[PDB]
């Protein structure tokens, strides 16, 4: 059995289980990995997830421009193809949020 320090633990994790981890830029992915790893390492044993009734029960953890009413149960990012140029919905905006306490 082998263990690793928290720094290389979060480096192994990388971005993590982000819903939009594949469409993001490498610079943004590196920055998100570094800041989230700093949170999960320095603020261990007191880092809670923010109450879901404030941000997650309203579906703000992952919002898509073409699905503002969450009719696809948060699966619009892969259920809906990206809009064509000019066609309504263009450009598509997708926001993923991670809120901690």
């Amino acid at each position: 059995t082998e263990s690793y320090p928290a720094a290389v633990a979060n480096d192994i994790i990388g971005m993590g289980s982000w819903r939009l981890k594949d469409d993001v830029d490498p610079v943004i992915e590196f920055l998100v990995a570094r800041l989230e790893g700093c949170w999960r390492e320095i603020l261990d044993t007191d880092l809670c997830l923010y109450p879901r009734e404030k941000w997650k029960e309203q579906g703000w953890d992952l919002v898509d421009s073409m699905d503002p009413h969450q009719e696809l149960e948060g699966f619009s990012y892969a259920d809906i193809p990206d809009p064509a140029k000019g066609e309504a919905g263009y450009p598509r905006l997708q926001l993923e949020n991670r809120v901690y306490c």
Binding site: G14, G16, S17, K21
Partner: protein, 74 residues
């Protein structure tokens, strides 16, 4: 309970098509979905599959919930 681990493995895997393929059906939004994502692990354990298939086949070959006439050639 059986498939939770593989589901988390699928949810926590980097798709390498958008990191491999560079610059009709262009852009790395429709170009990346032309074929299966490059998940590192993939597949299944062949023991989880054995348990799931055994459970479902024991459900359908031993209960006769909907088709009872299939007990005729038993």
């Amino acid at each position: 309970l059986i498939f939770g681990g593989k589901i988390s493995q699928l949810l926590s895997s980097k798709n390498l098509v958008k990191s491999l393929k560079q610059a009709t059906h262009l852009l790395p939004k429709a170009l990346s979905v032309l074929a299966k994502p490059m998940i590192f692990s993939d597949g299944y354990n062949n023991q989880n599959l054995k348990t799931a298939t055994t459970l479902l086949l024991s459900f359908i070959h031993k209960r006769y919930l909907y088709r009872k006439n299939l007990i005729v050639p038993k």
